[PDB]
Amino acid sequence: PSIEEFSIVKPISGKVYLGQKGGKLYAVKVVKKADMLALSKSPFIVHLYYSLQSANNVYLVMEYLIGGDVKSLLHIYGYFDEEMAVKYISEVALALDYLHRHGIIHRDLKPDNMLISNEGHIKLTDFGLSKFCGTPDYLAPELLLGRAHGPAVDWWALGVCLFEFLTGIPPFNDETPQQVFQNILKRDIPWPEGEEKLSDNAQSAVEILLTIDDTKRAGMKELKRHPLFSDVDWENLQHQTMPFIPQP
Ligand SMILES: [Cl-]
């Protein structure tokens, strides 16, 4: 496995490039060696292939997902209806539980980091393969206060993503980041009113996921037994049909 055997096609976007070998496409993220392994094979995690290290740079070869991220798809859709948001949130929750069972706290969950499989499924990344800094829309209250802080933070972020999937804008999103920090520490959740109202089960899930109390917050077991996820076949989730499929 040589690094020069990857014809760099297009830059994806701390930089990722679309490389090519024998017809196969790959997402190669570059990390400068100044900053600076273990395989995690899971249906809801971006599969990593190689970790080639050249002169003064380290290269990460991962599978290429043409579906993009969930933030862009959310901007196209404006917002997801309930069943799409619950499917996506379910898959992200299985990824989170797989990550916690391996001793990993994702610490940076957001729609930017959720990639879309060719069959419509969700794969997480930027959890240890790649990673204070704004935006603080997805940080838990215990993160702002500078305290410890365990894996429950990953679920708080989930409660944000859920809300963001259902309404369109994140709940604690506001003008300046200080105002956002206030909205988080005060837990001012701008519930939609009128005909755009959230269902009681959705409101319950967003409430139990966004609890200020670290030890009273929701986890994998809480969502499993939650009325919003009672239609979820957890033991066989990577074979459900997804509302959006990327092509070509
Ligand atoms: Cl968990």
- CATH code of residue 113: 1.10.510.10
Cα–ligand 1 centroid distance for 244 (angstroms): 27
Cα–ligand 1 centroid distance for 20 (angstroms): 36
Question: Catalytic one among 69, 97, 108, 137?
Answer: 108
What kind of experiment solved this structure? X-ray
Question: Is the peptide bond prior to 241 cis by the omega test (within 30 degrees of 0)?
Answer: no
3 plus 96 within the same structural domain:
no
Provide the number of structural domains found in the chain. Answer: 2
152 plus 199 within the same structural domain:
yes
Active site residue 108: yes
Q: Where do the H-state alpha helices sit in the chain?
A: 70-77, 82-101, 141-144, 152-167, 177-186, 200-209, 220-224
204 phi/psi in degrees, rounded to 5: -65, -40
Cα–ligand 1 centroid distance for 222 (angstroms): 9
Question: Any binding-site annotation on 14?
Answer: yes
If you ran DSSP here, which 8-state letter would residue 111 be given? Answer: G
62 plus 97 within the same structural domain:
no
Contact 70, 91 (CB under 8 A): no
14 plus 90 within the same structural domain:
no
Question: Any binding-site annotation on 15?
Answer: yes
Torsion 129-13-43-94 (CA) sign: positive
Beta-bridged to residue 57, according to DSSP, are 32
